[PDB]
Structure formats: structure tokens, C-alpha cells
Amino acid sequence: MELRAYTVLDALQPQLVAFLQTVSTGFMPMEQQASVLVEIAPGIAVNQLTDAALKATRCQPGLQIVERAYGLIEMHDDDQGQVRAAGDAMLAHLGAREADRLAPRVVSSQIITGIDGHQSQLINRMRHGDMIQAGQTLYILEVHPAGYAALAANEAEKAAPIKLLEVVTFGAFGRLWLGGGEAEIAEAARAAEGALAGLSGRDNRG
Amino acid sequence: MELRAYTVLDALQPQLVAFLQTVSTGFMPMEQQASVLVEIAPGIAVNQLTDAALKATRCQPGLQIVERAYGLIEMHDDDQGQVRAAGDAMLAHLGAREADRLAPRVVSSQIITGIDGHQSQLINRMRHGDMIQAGQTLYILEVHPAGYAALAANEAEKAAPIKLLEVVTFGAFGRLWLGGGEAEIAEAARAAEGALAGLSGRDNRG
Amino acid sequence: MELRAYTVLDALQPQLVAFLQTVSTGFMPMEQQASVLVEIAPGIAVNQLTDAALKATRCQPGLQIVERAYGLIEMHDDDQGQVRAAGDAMLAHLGAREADRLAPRVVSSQIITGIDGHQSQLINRMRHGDMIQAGQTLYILEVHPAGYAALAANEAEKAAPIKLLEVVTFGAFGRLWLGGGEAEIAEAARAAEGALAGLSGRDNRG
Amino acid sequence: MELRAYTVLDALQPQLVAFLQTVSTGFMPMEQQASVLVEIAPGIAVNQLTDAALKATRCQPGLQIVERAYGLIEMHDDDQGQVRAAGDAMLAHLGAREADRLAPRVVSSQIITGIDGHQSQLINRMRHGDMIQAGQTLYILEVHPAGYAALAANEAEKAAPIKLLEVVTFGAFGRLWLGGGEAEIAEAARAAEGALAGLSGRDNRG
Amino acid sequence: MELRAYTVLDALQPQLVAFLQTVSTGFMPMEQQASVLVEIAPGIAVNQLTDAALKATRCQPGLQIVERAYGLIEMHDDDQGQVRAAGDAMLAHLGAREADRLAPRVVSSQIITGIDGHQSQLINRMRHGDMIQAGQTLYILEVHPAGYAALAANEAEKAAPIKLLEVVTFGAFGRLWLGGGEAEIAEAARAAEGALAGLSGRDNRG
Amino acid sequence: MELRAYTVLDALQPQLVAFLQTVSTGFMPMEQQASVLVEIAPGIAVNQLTDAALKATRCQPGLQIVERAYGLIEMHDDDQGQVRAAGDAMLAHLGAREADRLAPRVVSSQIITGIDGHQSQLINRMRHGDMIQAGQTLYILEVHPAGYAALAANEAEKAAPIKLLEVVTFGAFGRLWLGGGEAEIAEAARAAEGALAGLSGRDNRG
């Protein structure tokens, strides 16, 4: 098993919670809960980590995804101590440490101001979070590995009042779409990429 | 055969446009366009109305729904005069005047303040518009016939800064879910209900 | 309890077979097979009919639908005699004769020539059969009860080279959409309507 | 306005829990939790009941369904007393006592032994619970109103080792499909029907 | 950003239009409009191209896809001058020229005559375009990169009267399924592969 | 064309049949039929194999999948002689022999005893076969190439009374989830991996 991504979110922000409540297949997170996300290869082996975390802690799983190649587990609890114990149990099962994850790589990042009404339509049709209106500012981010998109979303939301349009935290690449005012989006993007730049991990230049 | 609902929306507001862009099966509406919605029985006969409107005007259809019993067509254009011409062409084909529609009946209307986070989750999972967060105020409206829900949504959005969560404008009953601050929701609800109460039509008692 | 619709189709035509192969949940029909369709209330009791037919004949079920109120079973075989035997076994279990079905009621029937390209789009998005192009002729039919729509489709296809766009043979109402040239559609519509008008049954007024 | 169905399930059995975990849109139930289900008209007004229950108790909602006409809410908790308190809060908001519900009506009930492999296929394609194999015994039940189907499922599972194939507890009618051995299904069916026949309520004739 | 595919379609043919009207998520194309398709890596960055094209021209976007790795944008207009200006704006944003695209590679190509009725069933179940019947001829094509499948479909349709069954113009590989008569399919395949062979671009031998 | 996987299943076991009846897009298999599965690259070329098998034998196709990169065909018949003739026809078309397939590789394999109720929920939500309950034992297997998962499932089911929860026999990797008692799962896993270890084929160490 290879550790691809590992992140602890100290407190889930309300828009990310509402988004996860929309798309998650397990037990629903609630506002301000702590969360840990672990992405590994091979995919189906993530079930071993879920079992390790559940037998060790009272965390509940919100997301478990076995996709084309990779596997992702998200677990949450009111108490950060429980979420960190769950992460510890999963890392122990892997024989790994936190820094054995891949360092996040920003593949693509752009702020698009004054979006055309035809492009807001395309985003609205695709997204599962909030809607966007013509003339607002759009932030798009693509990251590798995918598991770091949730951290980027949560840190964006902490930093400025923006709208979470879509976050995809599994796949070959992770993706984030935000909408809002120009100044607010610039601050949110600053915070999201700053959070990713500060993480330890294996070289991942692609 | 029967005209159930007829409404002209003078200018589509941005959240209702974003919602319609998400759920519509035809040609996408844009902000501030005019729109006309016509609901009839029997369902498949709405195709006759669509043909009449398209041959007479430049309007484009956003929604055509043939559901269990009823049929709904929505047409839009930049020009209110084109939209009223489309509506008039459809009324003419049906053999009706606007006042032969059913008068809207408010089946249920309620404001729920300070929603619990578990109910926020339920709404987020169901809706196709914006998301709602714990502690916000929810407005819920059920109307008969269903085709009046869009007018209610548009007039609510004009009146106050609220979030459009979900609007269902076809079926046995039409339904509207809005979210936001308490004072804003109270104003939006007054505007929605006032719009429905001012419409002429045939007596439509439960 | 009630026999709503009963039809034996002597030979399934190729476009109707291709459509049924697209939407059916059971065992796929093939070209020129015979078929029997039975619609009853209450819905779940159609399972009793299916069991009776399967224990008595070699027929295979293509469709079994238990919808809001009603239940539909379609069975097919290379041999018309097996299919009539299956239908007879189902009628016997129900306690009925063929003529205890509801006589078909044409709710609406219309030919629309020279369809606008915007209406072609609406039909293409909705349908599960062939596509339609701008300027072609559309036939739309609504029948009650719904289970007679398949007979209408099959007889239409026998009579003229048309395109089967959509046929809905369960629900509160049955619906048929055909496309093609004007003369061809006129002949297909005559054949569909004539097939329904020739069927015995209980008076079924609106 | 109307109370249609009201049931308290003292302890959710493991197959019904696994089924609800598959289809529910809210917070997942767990084995042996208590549950209360309330079905009303009009549909959207179920949101008022959900709010009343959440503000009064610790119960969590598993299902909230606003369908064509009706609304259903299911709430659960480890403690039967919390669940009865939630039900009482909802009855109070509605203005009702438990006995103002509609008495359950068995629309259809049948055991089909030795199912044909073609019918096993049809059931497997439709269901969301366990699978059924050729030659097993099938129990089918249709009840009115729909909200009583869950009680029937839970009591069936308590009484005998059977397989829960499908339970539909909202709509115009509620439906239950069970599979297993002949003697086991006979005992489960007796328990389901006995549970429904023992409930007080308003006369509910067809 | 890497330019993978670039194609200008001078006039969209009616079956391809009907297909795109079925599957597209944006603004619907119409018969005989011009279209430009651009496929790039990384996926989410296609939003930058969409914005560039929309701010420069009056083209409307029919398809915007962000898939596992790649991104695709399609834009159309009545006037080829607008579509070519949109392509120019997108290429300018990329710092690229048309010949910086990958040359198309035919991965697999086959004509299958007299298809068996069991194989026409499989195709009918999968496809989103027209249906196929037993005994007709099938053309299957797989191309790399995927973005060239639309050009192949449009040129096929120009060349001979065939049926467009399915075209997949994004992914790791693009795919095309056509049905019809043997002579017509042979001509359509000739035209489709001839169009791909004539395009400039980077060596792409795989 | 490259032969990736080739397996003949002498007799399909009842749970695998019920699963295939749930997910298959072609002609439904029945209990104890023989089956052959062939996986190749490139994807769309699997249509050539389907045509070869159908023109040579009376087998019927249950599954035909053209996924991101690969193609899979499954064909079945009551008589193993017909299924082996179909496999022979497909291998002859490829110019291949059975041992030209990739040898199966077990990527990941684990037995998880006493599963937590939160993890049984996650499995129940994901799966298409039988349900799993809290405290049961889970077997998870990931294999490469994907086409060998069906053989593993069938051999597991022969070996011990277990529950087939999910089997994914196409993709980059094949996956199998089983549930049941600890001793039964250990025997089923033994049989599944033993079957894969005994197959000839090209070196496939990954």
C-alpha cells in the first residue's frame, strides 16, 4: 500500500459541510467537526484503514470511495483528539508516517473575473454546491494527488466569504471551483494554495 | 382539456435563472429575460402549444415536461413583448383567455426559523439550487396547480436577498424552498404569497 | 382489482423491438416475436400473473413494472400460440375474459407538420428511441389506460416507414411519439388509431 | 391536512437497517435502534414535523420524502423513549392523536412458492435489498397508506429468517417483497399481516 | 497546458446535431451551425479557453467536459467567422498554433456486416443516438486523442446516408458507432478516416 | 488487439447469476449456465469478438462493456460445448491462444473479521449484490487485469456458503467483496485465489 494523501481538517466549515452532506455516502458530517482524509493505492485496501480507525476510535466515516485506481476514506468527530487518533491508527496500519504522503502539487490555478453568463450556466449545470451568477469571479484549482482538494476548500472558506461551487477530492486529480467577489476570491485562493504549499511529503513534481 | 396555470414573468432573476439552467432540458434562459409558463391537461398536448409559440415568435423553450397527468411549457426571450405574444399564441390554440386558468391555491406556507443542522442536511441532499446552513431560516410553500411555483420564486427573489434552494413547478403540486435570514425570508414570503393572491382565475378550492 | 389493458401483438416490428431492448428490465425481445401485455390494479399483484404465465408456457418476460398504482407485465415468444397461452393463463388467474379490459380511450391525437428545430431538440432530449430532425412531421398520441400504447406503436410501424421516438406503455396514461415524413406519419397514425378503435372492452369514458 | 400513517418500531432489525442504509437520504440508522415513521398530507408540511421533533429530542432523521402528494419522515435513536417523544412532538404539532391515523388496509397479500428463474431475475433487477434465487418462495404485500410498509418489514424479520428484497414505504401504496424458504416466509407473512391488523385508526376502506 | 485536439466543423449535420442536443450540458447547437472543438490538458484549465472565446465572440458553448485527465470545450455559431475567431482566441490563450495539436491516430477501425440481433440489442442499450436493427451494417472506430471523434462523425454523415448511433468525443480515446447499409457505411467510413488522415499535427504514433 | 483476460466458467452459481442479472445490459444468464469472459484492448474492438462468437454459436451475450481503455464480452449457454466454441471463435479472431492472456495478479487481498456497523453501512450503500450486517466477516480482493474477478467470484461461491456483495469485472482493476462467517469466508478466499493462481498466461508482475 502507498500513502498518497493525508490531511487533518481541524474544523469543517459550513459550506464544505453542506457540500459533503450532499455527495457523501456514509455518515453525515456536521458543522465544526474535525475530519481526517486518507488516500491510498491500491483502492480496495482503503477498507483496511476504515476498519482500523473504527475499531480504535468513535469517529464516523463520511466518504469511502474506491475509484479506478485509488481509495479514499474520510472520518469525522466533534473532538479533534478522536480524529487524530483515527489518523494515527490508519498510519500505523500502513507502517507509514504523515510525511510519507505525496507533497501536494498545484497542477493548474486561475482566477477568472467577470464570468460570462454562458460560462456560469456551464458551471451551474456541473456543480453540486452553491450556484454562480453572471459577472461573478471564478477560482479553479487542480491538484495532485486528488485527496488534498478538501483541505484547499476548507482553508479557502476560512479565509474569505466565498461560495463553494464544487470540490472533487478523489480521482487522478483533485479539483476545486469557487465563486464570489474578486477581492474575496483572491484571498481564498491565497489561503488555499498557502495551505497546500506548507505540507510536508515526498517529492511530487510530476 | 384544461388550462391549469398561466404566468408571465417579466424578468427572470439571477438565482432562478441559475436554477433553471441546472434543471432545464431545452434552451437555457439568461438573466433578465422574460418567460411565460403554461400548464395544461392532457400532458402530451403541450406539444401543440409549443409548436404554436415557436411558429409565431422568436421565443426559445427552456422546459417542456410531460409528467404523469399534466404538461408544462416554459418559453423565454429578451423581449417581454415576444414572450406575451408566445403566451397569447398558446392561449389562442387552447381556446382560452388568461383568466380561464385555475386561480392559485396556497396549500401550505410556513417559515421555520433556526433550522436544526440535521434538517439543513436533509434539504441540502434534496435540492438543486443553493445550499442551506444550520441555524438559517427556511421558507416552504406548496401551491396548486404546480405551474405557479416559478412566479412565486421569481417574486420572492425580487423582494429580498434570499437563497433559492429548490423550486418544483410541475406535478400534482408545486413547491418552493427558500433559505436565508429571518427578516429577508419574511419579506420574500410576503412577496411570493402576494403574487399568487393577486392572480385572476377560476375558483380552485380544495 | 381490475383488468385495465390486454393486448396480443402478433409480431413485434424491428423499431419497437429496438426500443424495448433499450428500456426493458427483463429478458430481451427479438424481431418478429409475439408478445402479450397485461395491465392491472393493484400493482404488486402483477407478480401473480407473471408466475401463472411462466409456469404454463415458455414465454419470457421483457417488462414487469409496478408503478404508482398499476402493474404491467409483457411476455414474448417466437410462437404466437405460446403467447396467447400465456395471456389466457393470466386472464384465468385474474378471473377475467379479454373483453373485461377497459376499451381504449384516445385522450389526444395530433399530427404536427414541419416541426421547429427547437421542438426537435426537446423531443430528442426526452426520447429513448430514434432521433428526430428539424422540419420532420411529429405524431403524438395519449391513450387511457396506458397499456395500449405498445399495440398502437406496433401497428403504426407495420403500416408505414416512420421513426419510433418514444412509447410509454405504463402510468396513468400511455403515450406515443413518432417522427417522419408527412404522408408516412398520416398512414401510421391511421393504423394506430384504427387498432385501438377496433378493440372490445368495458366502456371507458373520461 | 391529514395524518395518514404513524408507527413506532421498537427495535430495527438488521436486514431492514441494511436496506434503510442503502436507500436513505439522511442520517443512517443502526441495528436495534428505535424508529418512528409519520406520513401526512400535504407533502411539504412534513418539514414542520421534522423541525418539531429535532428541537424536542436527540433523534436523527433517516428519511424525509416529499413525493407527489404525501410527506414521510423517519426518525431514530438508541432510546425508545426519545423516539416516542419525537413521535409525540410530531403528533402534537399536527393536532392529532395516534389513533387519528388511517387504519392499515391490506390491498393485496400473496405467497408465491417455487418462483421461476425468469421471475427471480425480474425481482433482482428491481430490488435494493437482498437477492433472490430460482425456486425460492416470494411474499408480496401492498398496503394503504404506504407508511405502514416499514412496520410490516420489521415484524416479518423478527418472526423468521427471511430475506428482505424490497420495501417501499412512501407513495400511493406501500409495498413489501420478501424471499426465502416456504415455511419461513409463511411465518414472516403472518407476522407482517398481524402487525397491521392490530393497529388502531380511522376506518380506511377502498 | 497541452493542446491535444483542435477541429473546426464548417456545418454541423442534422444527426450529429440531434445527438449533441441529447447529451450536451450547455447551449444547444442547431442544424448547419459551425462549431469548434478544443481538447487540452490539464482538464480544469479548459475554463480559461471558454472564457477567452466568450469574451471575444458571440459563440455559445454546447459542451464543456472536465473528465479524469482532459478538458473539452465545444462552441458554435451560425457564422463560421465567429467560430474561427473563437478558435483563434483559444489558441492565442494557449500560445499555440493549430498544428500544435496531436495528429489523429486511428486505434481501431472495422466494418461488421449483417449484425446479429443479439449484438444490435447490445448497441441499442448503450447508444444515445439512433437505434440499429438486426442485419444492418455496423462501423466502429476508436481514435486518439478523443476530441477528433466529432469531426469523424460529421464527415461520415456528409458522405453517405447512415445512422449515427453513438459518438464519444472525450476520454482517453474517442469512439464512433454508425449503422446502415453496407455500401453507405463503407463510404461513410472512407470519409471519416480520410478526414482524420488529412490533419496536420504533432507525431502521435502511440 | 491484445488479449488481457480469458476465462471459461463451467457453471454459473446462483448468487453470481443473480448479481449478473442485476447489472448486465444484454441477455440474462440463468443458473448453472456455462459462460466465457474475454477482456481485450482496444476497447471498441471487442465488438469484433462478439460478432465472431454469435455467428459461430448459439451463445447469448450478457455483458458487453467498452470502458475507458478496455473491452469485455461475456457469453453464456446451457451447454459448455457452445461456450467453449464461442471462446475458440474469439481466440481465432484474435490470432491468439488461451495462454496469451495475462496471468492473473492478486493486487490486494484481505479478510476483515467482525466488521463495524459503520463499515457495513458503507458496503451496503455501494454494493449491487446481497447486503452485509454488522459483525460479519468481509473479504476484499483486487486483481489485475479486471476480467478475472468473475472467475474468483464463481469459485468462491462453489467453495463455501458466503454472500456475494459486489464484483467488478472490468476497469483498470477487478474487485470482489464477499460477506459471511469467518470460517466460510476463509474457505471462499482460499478457493478464489487458488483458482487465479492456477491459470496460465503471460508474466504479469506489475
UniProtKB/Swiss-Prot annotation, chains A, B, C, D, E, F:
Segments carrying motif Pore gating residues: 67-68
Major subcellular location class: other
Effect of disrupting the coding gene: Not required for efficient BMC formation; when deleted from an artificial operon (Hoch_5815, Hoch_5812, Hoch_3341, Hoch_5816, Hoch_4425, Hoch_4426, Hoch_5814) being expressed in E.coli, a 2-fold decrease in BMC formation is seen.
GO CC term (a single one): bacterial microcompartment
Main function: A minor component of the bacterial microcompartment (BMC) shell. Expression of 5 proteins in E.coli (BMC-H (Hoch_5815), BMC-P (Hoch_5814), and 3 BMC-T (Hoch_5812, Hoch_5816, Hoch_3341)) forms 40 nm artificial BMCs with a molecular mass of 6.5 MDa. One of 2 stacked pseudohexamers in the BMC. There are 20 BMC-T pseudohexamers per BMC, composed of mixed BMC-T1, BMC-T2 and BMC-T3. The shell facets are 20-30 Angstroms thick, with 1 of the stacked BMC-T trimers protruding to the exterior.
Quaternary organization: Homotrimerizes to form a pseudohexamer. These stack, with the concave faces together, with the concave faces together, in purified bacterial microcompartments (BMC).
Entry-linked SUPFAM superfamilies: CcmK-like (SSF143414)
Key words, A-Z: Bacterial microcompartment
InterPro entries: BMC_CP, BMC_dom, CcmK-like_sf
Protein name, UniProt field: Bacterial microcompartment protein trimer-3
Domains as described in the record: These proteins have 2 BMC domains which evolve independently of each other, giving the term pseudohexamer to the trimerized subunit. Although the homotrimer fills the approximate space of a BMC hexamer protein, the BMC-T trimers are more compact. Their universal presence in BMCs indicates their structural importance. The homohexamers form pores of at least 5 Angstroms in diameter; in the stacked homohexamer both pores are closed. In the BMC the inner pore is fully or partially closed while the outer pore is closed.
Entry similarity comment: Belongs to the EutL/PduB family.
Compartments it resides in: Bacterial microcompartment
Naturally occurring in which organism (per UniProt): Haliangium ochraceum (strain DSM 14365 / JCM 11303 / SMP-2)
Occurrences of domain BMC circularly permuted (ranges): 2-104, 105-206
Biotechnology note: Artificial BMCs can be made in E.coli by expressing (Hoch_5815, Hoch_5812, Hoch_3341, Hoch_5816, Hoch_4425, Hoch_4426, Hoch_5814) or (BMC-H (Hoch_5815), BMC-P (Hoch_5814), and 3 BMC-T (Hoch_5812, Hoch_5816, Hoch_3341)). Cargo proteins can be targeted to this BMC.
